[PDB]
Design a protein around this ligand. Structure first.
Ligand SMILES: Nc1ncnc2c1ncn2[C@@H]1O[C@H](COP(=O)(O)OP(=O)(O)OP(=O)(O)O)[C@@H](O)[C@H]1O
Ligand SMILES: Nc1ncnc2c1ncn2[C@@H]1O[C@H](COP(=O)(O)OP(=O)(O)OP(=O)(O)O)[C@@H](O)[C@H]1O
Ligand SMILES: Nc1ncnc2c1ncn2[C@@H]1O[C@H](COP(=O)(O)OP(=O)(O)O)[C@@H](O)[C@H]1O
Ligand SMILES: Nc1ncnc2c1ncn2[C@@H]1O[C@H](COP(=O)(O)OP(=O)(O)O)[C@@H](O)[C@H]1O
Ligand SMILES: [Mg+2]
Ligand SMILES: [Mg+2]
Lengths: 62, 247, 247, 247, 247
């Protein structure tokens, strides 16, 4: 009934089975290969992805 | 009836928001005994606010900025060499009246274009027109216009905007013969409108970049007469700052 | 304050009438406690009425009509050749949808130009665009345009109007150049837009008028394919008015 | 012949007015040589006007309104408790779109029923459907319907109307059966259609009026969720008219 | 304006064809000086003709005929036993006034249903209602209605139509107890409306088909009192006629 609930269930399902079941070709649990991965470090501050609009305040202040 | 006629007349007079909210405003004025004059003022003020919002939207669209950024997403702790108060003062747009030119100079990735675009956004917010271009791109467009013979049109396009954001002055080097286009733009805007410049090459390299010493000297003599130059000393934010602060 | 801001918003939203009459209408509403919706409706209705008035004035100005005439000014007892029924049905402006061209033929001073001017005025009043040109002036302007190479511009200018009223036809003789100019004008506005023409010569005489029997016959055949003829007969109203002034 | 066939066709196409007035309008057109289009337009306009008149008469008949009253008949100087502005804004009939219920409260003879009848009359005039019922009669009819098992029929009949005017509320005391009948009526027309109610007792007294504090509180809470209150205070207009008649 | 208002009023008065053609009719009356009365008559007559066409369409739809056929596709050379003139006389629909019943009797495939449906189509053309049913089907529907208790509704459905086409009387045999439904229909329509019957079983087999001798005798006594019986002697057209004529 809520997208937050759906995302929570999806993440739990992934971490339970999807990223735990061994792959049919690599034949190994994805998390072990993840541990083998070497990704570049993240920046401290994330690229701000937020709608930016300019508005005007009414006479009263509303 | 009257409701449909009011809607039709509001649409024919180009008052969409007024057509949408006139019933609600009438009800509110009814429940508070608002004077007729204040009712009219409320409607007109709402319409004006919405129209100004759409105007700012159009101006930001035509600014041709690569993206949208603001001082809010800027950290002055990572750039302590230059004073924070001066940038805040610039945000008051007092330079637009003085016609002074704003120059950002520093190593690549130190936030030059970010600050320039932020100031341009502040200028666009208060109605002032702004045009963003890269110096080499501007010179190439002017050269093409001159070849086609209608150079004055593009020259007016570049000179009319109140704020001109010329970026990446040293990134690319076009044929030196085309530097006269850049000189034309800078001199025509001289003592008329501010120019926002951002680049990572010292003032001595201009003769090399444009392939002409005296031409660059004159360009700088005019661009630096009324200006406030900010020199940013540091290291590339994206890589160096994160690497040195994650320790 | 509020009144000055209301004036500024009215003149920034293109509301000329409201800028002045809003105070008077507020006074009127206060004297009768009119509802807010009705007050707004009155303001908008006055604005729309004045806007339409100004638009019609502009349309009449663009039409180049020598003077304003209306069917209400046209007496029909003095002109028993035709009947009010046909004239008023034409004034309904159905020929525009049917693309029927209207031709008036009669002796000088009968009134075949008054009816055309009235039709043009009504077409303007009903939102259509009308252009009134004399055949001689039309030919001269077309010849000049061809000389300067801008013939296409003037042809577009003369074809764009929904109703083209060509006056002073037949009295002046035409050369084959003018003949082909007239033929081109007719062809461009043939089955595309009505043509209102007033002449004093029968169709057969057009061969001598233009000096080309074949071209005149082609013009007549194309015109009569969608045409309405009006053979007006009677004593010249100019002469009768002069006689009445004498007595 | 033709006249009789015209009459037959008019009465076979449901054109009552044209059957009679067509001859008179033909006479009028002949006396002025009116255009065919205008003649047809006059016929159709007269037919439409009379059709709308008959439709409005039928709607008023169905409404069961005891008598026809209009705001134009309602003097406001004699009733200074409320202002013309609010009443006329209600007469604009925006509450129907907003589904706001209207409640009038005041001493006997103040005029809280005249305003309701005027609102119903205007709603009828603007194409809406109105049903005027007294609370006592409503309760009695609902009780009879429940006795006969046709309660659903009467509930549909009382909920279908766009505007339901419930009169004579508070003066007569109600039992819990009538209390639940009123609650059901309100619930069915809650956020679905406006209810216009006139009473003489404060909201708190409704608990004693219906004999159920909880049910009365529920009714009041649901009603006030979308409500407009009118506290009318003044000398009874019946008494003042009687005094004026005496003097 | 007026054209749009005329269109709207014609649509609101349910005069679609009038709305479509009023301009053309006005123009034609203009070009021929048709009187206003004749103009109105033309419009009304066209509307009446179109309405009658649509009415006939609806009547043929509700006739529930399996298909549409006419005397045009009928060859009287293949059926020389019976007179052609009598069928042509029937096409005058003089039997509808006399209330006489029309019976077609002959071997299968000899064209019974064709002629019956043709006569029914002629009746439908001139406005008379007509209902086509198969005798066994009619009896079964009446039995179901009687079981449900609302028999009178279906009885009225079967009795109201001016022309009833009962076909395939002998094709199927339902429970004899249901023959009273057929008797009810025939007796109720007796001396009120014609009945068109078509079947290939002699009058003596009715007692067997309905499983009752006296009931069938009474049915025939009533159905044959006022009637014109046509006995078709021949062979199945589709097979025998083609086989014998291709030789
Ligand atoms: N029926 C009429 N009623 C009133 N005024 C008329 C009538 N007919 C003509 N006039 C007058 O005629 C004068 C204009 O001349 P008119 O329209 O008769 O010329 P025309 O038809 O254009 O003739 P020409 O052949 O010279 O071009 C105006 O004063 C107009 O008032
Ligand atoms: N402001 C007014 N102007 C004119 N007539 C009025 C006014 N107020 C009341 N009346 C008169 O009141 C009479 C109807 O009674 P009224 O509408 O005052 O009763 P009510 O509000 O329904 O009271 P109650 O509590 O008895 O139901 C009508 O004659 C109407 O003319
Ligand atoms: N001081 C700072 N605060 C926040 N973000 C910064 C800062 N300096 C650089 N950035 C980030 O780096 C980018 C700006 O680099 P820029 O100044 O355009 O480099 P260049 O001038 O070489 O094009 C932006 O994405 C911005 O978010
Ligand atoms: N005399 C005829 N002329 C033309 N068509 C005929 C004739 N007789 C029969 N038909 C054809 O045969 C069919 C009618 O058979 P029908 O009378 O319905 O047989 P039944 O009465 O056994 O149902 C139709 O398709 C019709 O075209
Ligand atoms: Mg003329
Ligand atoms: Mg009352």
């Amino acid at each position: 009934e809520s997208i937050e609930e759906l995302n929570f269930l999806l993440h739990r399902w992934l971490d339970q089975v999807a990223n735990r079941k061994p792959n049919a070709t690599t034949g190994i649990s994805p998390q072990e290969r993840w541990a083998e991965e070497s990704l570049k470090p993240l920046p401290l501050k994330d690229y701000d992805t937020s709608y930016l609009s300019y508005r005007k305040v009414h006479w009263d202040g509303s | 009836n009257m409701k449909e006629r009011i809607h039709e007349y509001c649409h024919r007079l180009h008052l969409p928001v007024m057509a949408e909210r006139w019933s609600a405003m009438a009800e509110y004025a009814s429940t508070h005994n608002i004077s007729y004059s204040e009712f009219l003022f409320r409607l007109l003020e709402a319409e004006i606010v919405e129209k100004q919002a759409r105007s700012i939207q159009t101006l930001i669209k035509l600014s041709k900025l690569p993206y949208r950024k603001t001082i809010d997403t800027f950290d002055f702790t990572a750039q302590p060499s230059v004073d924070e108060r001066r940038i805040r003062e610039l945000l008051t747009l007092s330079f637009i009246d003085r016609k002074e030119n704003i120059l950002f100079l520093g190593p690549p990735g130190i936030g030059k274009t970010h600050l320039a675009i932020s100031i341009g956004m502040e200028a666009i917010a208060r109605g002032y027109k702004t045009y963003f271009i890269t110096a080499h791109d501007l010179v190439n467009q002017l050269r093409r216009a001159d070849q086609e013979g209608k150079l004055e049109k593009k020259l007016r396009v570049f000179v009319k905007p109140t704020v001109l954001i010329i970026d990446q002055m040293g990134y690319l080097k076009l044929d030196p013969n085309s530097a006269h286009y850049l000189f034309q733009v800078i001199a025509r805007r001289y003592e008329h409108a501010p120019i926002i410049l951002t680049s990572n090459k010292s003032f001595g390299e201009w003769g090399e970049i444009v392939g002409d010493s005296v031409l660059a000297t004159a360009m700088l003599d005019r661009l630096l007469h009324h200006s406030i130059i900010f020199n940013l000393k540091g290291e590339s934010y994206r890589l160096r700052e994160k690497r040195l602060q994650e320790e």
